[PDB]
């Protein structure tokens, strides 16, 4: 059987809040089998719960936020997420005591880590899958994306920033999805942004916790970091990163594969849930061994 999988103990960490800048501190618990993943802000009493679902995100300039049915609001779900859908986690707690996730180092390595660092545990029940079983895709002027058929994990991404320290050559990454994959070929991956627009921001009072130790920062002309990239190709990686948690905001991996053409939050979502509303184009699909067949249905 292909199981469900949660955590094998509470763990803890702190770090920098985006757009406060304040350190906050993250828990995550383990969860029994059929309960999703779970966001929960315990700054707030009572606390409130924000069930991963796609029709619950709200997007922004600087980060992915889940609302709940009173427009509460808790921020950088984005690459906490795409860890857990690399790790394949079903179930989980994830607690805050504060508005936002911390932004860590900009990419999913650290909460990898962290995830590891609690250990994995596999619960006594199928995983569910969500199967691609049509074509389905979504635009927004020149950009788009699209799922088709295809039995495995696959994710296609292309860019376009005309940026001077992008070169085409590294526009484009296709991989076959896997854990293994996501750690080593994606989870390192940092989020970007322009020097002008930090300090734009931070001039308002505005994304306090941006900093060389969160993101890629980049000028007109160059990338601003001290040792340079950890890919060349790590912008496009990172898209590619920020899907992979879209895609998850539906509490299932799916089974299928994903091109996209200059996509975002916004338009990846779109997708989704274009996908999800589409009843013919999806279904749930499950995995066992011969042996757990029901001792009935062994009847030629
Ligand atoms: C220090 C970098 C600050 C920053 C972070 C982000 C960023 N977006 C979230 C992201 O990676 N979503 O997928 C994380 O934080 C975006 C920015 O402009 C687009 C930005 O520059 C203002
Ligand atoms: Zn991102």
């Not at 199967?131 to 927004?140: A, L, M, N, P, Q």
């Not at 699209?146 to 085409?168: M, Q, R, V």
Request: aromatic share 10%.
């Amino acid at each position: 059987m292909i199981k469900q999988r949660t955590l094998k103990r509470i763990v803890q960490a702190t770090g920098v809040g985006l757009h406060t800048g304040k350190k906050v501190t993250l828990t995550l618990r383990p969860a029994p089998a059929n309960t999703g993943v779970i966001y929960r802000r315990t700054d707030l009493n009572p606390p409130v719960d924000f069930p991963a679902d796609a029709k619950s995100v709200r997007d922004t300039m600087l980060c992915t936020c889940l609302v709940n049915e009173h427009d509460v609001r808790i921020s950088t779900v984005e690459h906490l997420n795409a860890a857990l859908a690399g790790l394949g986690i079903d179930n989980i707690v994830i607690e805050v005591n504060a508005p936002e996730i911390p932004i860590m180092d900009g990419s999913a390595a650290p909460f990898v880590y962290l995830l590891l660092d609690a250990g994995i545990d596999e619960l006594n029940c199928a995983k569910k899958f969500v199967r691609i079983k049509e074509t389905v895709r979504v635009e927004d002027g020149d950009k788009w994306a699209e799922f088709k058929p295809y039995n495995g994990f696959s994710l296609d991404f292309t860019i376009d920033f005309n940026h001077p320290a992008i070169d085409s050559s590294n526009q484009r990454y296709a991989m076959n999805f896997s854990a293994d994959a996501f750690m080593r070929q994606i989870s390192r991956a940092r989020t970007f942004g322009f020097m002008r627009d930090i300090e734009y921001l931070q001039s308002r009072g505005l994304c306090l916790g941006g900093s060389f130790d969160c993101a890629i920062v980049v000028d007109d002309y160059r990338v601003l970091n001290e040792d340079g990239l950890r890919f060349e190709d790590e912008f496009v990686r990172h898209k590619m990163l920020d899907a992979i948690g879209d895609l998850f905001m539906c509490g299932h991996n799916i089974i299928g594969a994903f091109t996209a053409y200059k996509s975002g939050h916004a338009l990846n979502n779109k997708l989704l849930q274009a996908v999800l509303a589409k009843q013919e184009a999806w279904e749930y699909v499950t995995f066992q061994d011969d042996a757990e067949l029901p001792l009935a249905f062994k009847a030629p």
